[PDB]
Amino acid sequence: VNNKKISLKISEATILITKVVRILELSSKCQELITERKFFKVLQNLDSLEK
Amino acid sequence: FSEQVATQEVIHSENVIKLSKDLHTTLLTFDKLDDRLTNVTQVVSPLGD
Known part of the structure; x- marks a missing residue:
């Protein structure tokens, strides 16, 4: 014991x-999905996340 | 902490201590064992005789 x-x-x-760790990754995907009507760091930070 | 080290204290200290005391009493038991075995076969000389 x-x-x-x-x-x-x-x-x-x-x-x-x-x-x-998984909290960090899903946190980053939440940071991706949060960005609406910006469309500029979308592919930048999102494609950084998928990497 | 010292719950775990209390298991080291009671378990290790009492285990070593009563291990030596109970195993030494067990050595006295083995003294009685070879005592009764020696008197046993010594009484069993009349068997072969």
């Missing part, structure tokens, strides 16, 4: 990291 404790913070930490 000290290894369930350390294991719990371990996999909690790693899943927190990957959750932060």
Whole structure:
């Protein structure tokens, strides 16, 4: 239970990291989809995101 | 923290301590074991005899 404790913070930490990663990517796609009636950084930042 | 190190303290300290005490008492048990075995086969000389 000290290894369930350390294991719990371990996999909690790693899943927190990957959750932060996908949060960043979907956050960037939200930054893409937010831009309406601009059409200029659309292909720039959006095509940067899809890269 | 010292819940986990309390498992190190009680579990490691008591495990090592009563490991030596219980295993040494088990060595006294093995002394009684070879005692009764020696008296056993020594009484079992009349079997072959």
